[PDB]
Amino acid sequence: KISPSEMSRLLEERIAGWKTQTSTEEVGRVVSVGDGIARLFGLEGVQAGELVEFQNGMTGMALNLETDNVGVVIFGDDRSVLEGDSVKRT
């Protein structure tokens, strides 16, 4: 049971004193994908019912805001989304 903030690419920054949290409230990284759902880390500032847009042109609705992630439902197929793909608001 681990949170997206606790993965061993971010903790290599936190332990190393890196304070590059200047990544805005607009951009987030995909964390998980499946069955028309995506799960992101970031976008602290996104509204419920808001549209977001992926790297590969597709778009989705953010529905399940959470303390550690954001839940997104996709208007398409999950073959386009993977592995920390950037997601930006509209």
Binding site: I2, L11, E12, I15, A16
Partner: protein
């Protein structure tokens, strides 16, 4: 793998890269000893009545008031941000094991009763030429099922060499009860 495994791998990595190994090792050892000796630092870590700001303030005052690296302070700030401070002990243990495994193994070993300095020397030199690992800090034990012949486990899991009397005997018997 586990959470403490994750933080321990991250710390072992960064402390091998930038600050140093020995510094963070001593820092974790000091923290673990203060945790197991003070008996109130542990409660300070576990209790939820302590606010995050009081936690960070006391942690920084421990940083300044003790010989302390910045990497360990960042570890503690991360564990507090993610509610993982009780895993300090586990993390420390994980950090402890890797370094001593990198340098030299400790192995278990069994006899019947007290052997002699002569065959003790023979045992250690034979196990040393078998390992080809220049550092070996062993254990002695006494279990008399393996009658007197020196059984042991050089501690890496996939080598339990069962040099014993009763075990070879029973294996041989069960072999020679075969049909024809």
């Amino acid at each position: 793998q586990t959470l403490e495994g994750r933080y321990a791998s991250a710390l072992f990595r960064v402390a091998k890269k930038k600050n140093q190994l020995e510094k963070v090792y001593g820092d974790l050892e000091s923290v673990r000893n203060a945790l197991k000796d003070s008996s109130e630092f542990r409660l300070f870590v576990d209790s939820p009545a302590v606010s995050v700001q009081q936690k960070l303030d006391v942690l920084r005052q421990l940083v300044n008031r003790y010989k302390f690296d910045p990497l360990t302070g960042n570890l503690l700030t991360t564990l507090v941000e993610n509610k993982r401070l009780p895993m300090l002990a586990r993390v420390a243990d994980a950090f402890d094991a890797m370094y001593r495994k990198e340098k030299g193994e400790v192995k278990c070993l069994v006899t019947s009763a007290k052997p002699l300095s002569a065959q003790q020397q023979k045992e250690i030199v034979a196990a040393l030429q078998n390992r080809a690992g220049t550092q070996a800090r062993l254990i002695i034990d006494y279990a008399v099922s393996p009658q007197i012949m020196g059984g042991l486990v050089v501690r890496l899991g996939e080598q339990v060499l069962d040099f014993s009397v009763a075990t070879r005997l029973d294996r041989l018997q069960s072999q020679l009860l075969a049909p024809l």
